Amino acid sequence: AGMFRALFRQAVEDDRYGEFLDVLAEASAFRPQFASPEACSERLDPVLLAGGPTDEGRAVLVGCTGTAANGGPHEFLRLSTSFQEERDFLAVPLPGYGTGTALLPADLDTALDAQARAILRAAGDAPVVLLGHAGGALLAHELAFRLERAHGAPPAGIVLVDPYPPGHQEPIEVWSRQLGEGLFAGELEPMSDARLLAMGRYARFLAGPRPGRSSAPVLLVRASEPLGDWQEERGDWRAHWDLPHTVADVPGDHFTMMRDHAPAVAEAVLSWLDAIE
Amino acid sequence: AGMFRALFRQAVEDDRYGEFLDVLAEASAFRPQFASPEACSERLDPVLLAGGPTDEGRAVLVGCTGTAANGGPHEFLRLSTSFQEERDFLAVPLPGYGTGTALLPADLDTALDAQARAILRAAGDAPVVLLGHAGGALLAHELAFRLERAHGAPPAGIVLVDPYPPGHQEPIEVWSRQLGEGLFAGELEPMSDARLLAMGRYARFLAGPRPGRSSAPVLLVRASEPLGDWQEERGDWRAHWDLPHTVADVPGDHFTMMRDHAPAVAEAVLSWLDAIE
Numbered sequence: 001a002g003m004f005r006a007l008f009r010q011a012v013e014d015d016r017y018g019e020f021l022d023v024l025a026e027a028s029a030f031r032p033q034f035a036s037p038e039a040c041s042e043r044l045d046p047v048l049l050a051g052g053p054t055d056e057g058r059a060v061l062v063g064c065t066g067t068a069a070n071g072g073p074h075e076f077l078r079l080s081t082s083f084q085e086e087r088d089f090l091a092v093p094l095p096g097y098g099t100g101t102a103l104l105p106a107d108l109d110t111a112l113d114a115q116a117r118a119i120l121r122a123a124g125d126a127p128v129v130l131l132g133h134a135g136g137a138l139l140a141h142e143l144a145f146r147l148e149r150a151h152g153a154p155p156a157g158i159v160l161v162d163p164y165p166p167g168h169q170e171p172i173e174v175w176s177r178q179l180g181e182g183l184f185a186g187e188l189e190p191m192s193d194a195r196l197l198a199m200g201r202y203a204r205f206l207a208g209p210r211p212g213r214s215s216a217p218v219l220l221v222r223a224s225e226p227l228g229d230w231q232e233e234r235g236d237w238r239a240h241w242d243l244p245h246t247v248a249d250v251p252g253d254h255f256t257m258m259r260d261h262a263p264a265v266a267e268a269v270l271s272w273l274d275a276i277e
Numbered sequence: 278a279g280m281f282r283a284l285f286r287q288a289v290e291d292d293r294y295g296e297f298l299d300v301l302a303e304a305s306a307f308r309p310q311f312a313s314p315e316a317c318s319e320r321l322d323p324v325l326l327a328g329g330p331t332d333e334g335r336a337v338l339v340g341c342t343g344t345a346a347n348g349g350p351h352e353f354l355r356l357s358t359s360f361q362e363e364r365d366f367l368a369v370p371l372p373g374y375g376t377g378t379a380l381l382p383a384d385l386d387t388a389l390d391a392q393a394r395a396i397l398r399a400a401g402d403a404p405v406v407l408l409g410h411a412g413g414a415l416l417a418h419e420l421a422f423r424l425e426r427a428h429g430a431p432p433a434g435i436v437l438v439d440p441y442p443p444g445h446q447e448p449i450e451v452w453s454r455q456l457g458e459g460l461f462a463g464e465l466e467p468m469s470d471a472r473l474l475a476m477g478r479y480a481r482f483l484a485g486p487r488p489g490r491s492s493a494p495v496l497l498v499r500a501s502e503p504l505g506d507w508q509e510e511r512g513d514w515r516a517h518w519d520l521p522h523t524v525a526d527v528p529g530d531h532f533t534m535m536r537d538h539a540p541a542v543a544e545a546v547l548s549w550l551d552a553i554e
């Protein structure tokens with residue numbers, strides 16, 4: 001495929017995953033942007049991946065697509081089967097990843113506002129519970145806060161699957177080559193250069209200062225196996241979030257928790273949703 | 278073509294040529310490199326573009342290819358016709374631009390050493406006079422110093438056609454937009470991403486600290502037209518070199534001095550070579 005992918009493959013080989021994401025972020029600034037939610041390229045209409053039973057007033061689940069350049073409307077396919085006849089599961093796309101190619105968001109708030117609009121239109125009057133994995137976990141929380149402060153509509157809950165927020169990212173740096181190697185392993189087709197630029201841009205968004213904590217209760221789902229070696233004397237390698245409502249540990253590692261062990265994640269979410277309703 | 282080209286086009290549209298060259302330099306570090314002159318991809322054999330008359334001991338002219346990503350073995354075609362029946366003119370390629378694609382030089386000295394080997398093999402025992410335009414002007418002098426100090430073979434002269442060395446580059450930054458538009462206008466084909474990366478890497482080499490002046494006499498050739506608008510209170514907009522042996526002004530601007538007015542450049546060179554011989 002493209003040169004950015006080739007360069008990225010080399011950087012992951014050289015254990016410089018982080019340095020090249022910075023290049024991707026810098027480079028992405030020259031892509032055409034949208035500065036208002038109105039100006040967004042894509043239809044962010046959420047895709048219905050599971051239907052719950054027939055009713056009322058039950059929360060619907062919204063999957064917030066992660067940052068991975070190999071990602072897309074297939075992240076939640078395996079997870080969603082476990083919600084069939086249990087909950088509606090809607091997957092909302094991340095602006096900048098579609099198809100010309102898609103405009104990039106001018107800042108993260110403009111992307112969130114475009115998602116907030118499509119989510120409120122699709123969910124109707126049902127309460128919404130936001131779910132995201134890894135980078136998507138961080139996006140799920142920023143979308144939660146945006147819905148609350150800017151659209152006056154806080155979600156009923158947030159599910160954070162293996163989040164590594166700023167200040168708790170030491171494991172994610174020690175294992176960066178495993179993380180970089182994971183992106184290339186997950187390729188169904190080659191990662192496009194446009195999507196790699198989108199990924200770098202969003203990675204930079206999420207490293208920035210985003211004060212503002214959602215009111216919504218948090219289910220923290222954590223992998224149980226480390227992704228790489230780790231001396232326990234360094235402290236905890238696990239995913240972290242401040243003051244969760246509930247913590248669930250599931251089999252697998254950062255990656256496999258969402259593949260081979262997706263049902264374990266779904267079971268933790270379903271038990272948690274009943275508890276808070 | 279490729280995404281680096283797409284981004285670069287947007288950058289010159291947005292008048293951010295300089296910022297995007299910095300991106301190209303950063304991305305170029307993730308390209309395959311050669312760390313010793315032996316390991317060089319290309320043959321670098323100079324191409325004979327003009328023949329002088331039959332002799333002995335007259336200098337041959339060596340054209341040092343510039344950094345332009347749209348460049349190649351055609352930079353000196355129009356200029357060289359004016360040396361036919363006057364001087365041998367050899368055009369030596371710049372390492373990193375050929376064909377797989379070509380390895381990038383790990384530093385500038387490795388590229389210069391690879392060129393030094395091919396030039397000495399080609400020039401035989403004739404004295405050598407290096408010629409370069411703009412960025413190539415800077416490369417010719419770094420090559421002159423390299424030939425003298427590293428290969429014990431100082432050239433007989435250097436011809437610097439419109440050089441803007443560090444510390445005298447203010448006019449060429451103000452006109453960076455015209456430089457970028459010139460690159461795209463000059464495209465015989467689309468600039469490949471590999472060559473844009475090479476161009477960025479060489480630009481970075483040539484901004485860095487390179488003390489050390491060649492012993493060889495310098496003919497400084499200067500355009501007479503500004504490339505763009507210019508407030509005279511900013512000073513002299515013209516190309517600069519410290520303590521030139523001879524200064525020649527020719528019609529045209531930074532660009533057209535080598536196109537429509539190449540014969541005036543050649544006439545300045547031919548008189549100069551006779552004086553110093």
Ligand SMILES: *C(=O)OCCS[C@H](C)c1cc2c(cc1[N+](=O)[O-])OCO2
Nearest residue numbers: 067068133134135136162163164203
């Ligand atoms: C999930 O892994 O995100 C996909 C991009 S991987 C990147 C190194 C990463 C990993 C984690 C978080 C963010 C993030 N990122 O986009 O920078 O958070 C949680 O774990």
Ligand SMILES: *C(=O)OCCS[C@H](C)c1cc2c(cc1[N+](=O)[O-])OCO2
Nearest residue numbers: 344345411412439440441449480483
């Ligand atoms: C000649 O114009 O070189 C073509 C590439 S433009 C690049 C920014 C540049 C422009 C000039 C000089 C060097 C140079 N460079 O750093 O490569 O010098 C003269 O004008």
